[PDB]
């Protein structure tokens, strides 16, 4: 019970730290890769058009 509540608070703190600091950069890297592939496909389409 009490140890369960303490562990739950610890997990909440861990999740808050992750979402606050590590989630933004991983999301940014994901978006960067998405934009890179989008640009590659757009450039392929532009090369076909040319």
């Amino acid at each position: 019970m009490s140890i369960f509540i303490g562990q739950l608070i610890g997990f909440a703190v861990i999740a808050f730290i992750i979402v606050k600091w590590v989630v933004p950069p991983v999301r940014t890297l994901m978006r960067n890769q998405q934009e890179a592939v989008r640009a590659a496909l757009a450039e392929s389409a532009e090369a076909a058009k040319k």
Binding site: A40, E43, S44, A47, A48, K50
Partner: protein
């Protein structure tokens, strides 16, 4: 990766294709100029021959 390589190859091939289409344009321009110059040259040469033989006939 194949699409990336094909896009690069397409860019290079289209660049050289526009270059070669232009080069063909000047090449056929020069070709037409050469044939026009020929036509004129052989026409005037035949005229020279005809006028020379007419001069010979007149002299005789």
């Amino acid at each position: 990766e194949a699409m990336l390589a094909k896009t690069a190859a397409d860019n290079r091939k289209s660049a050289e294709q526009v270059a070669a289409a232009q080069a063909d344009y000047e090449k056929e321009m020069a070709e037409a100029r050469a044939q026009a110059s020929a036509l004129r040259d052989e026409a005037r040469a035949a005229g020279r021959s005809v006028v020379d033989e007419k001069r010979a006939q007149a002299s005789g």
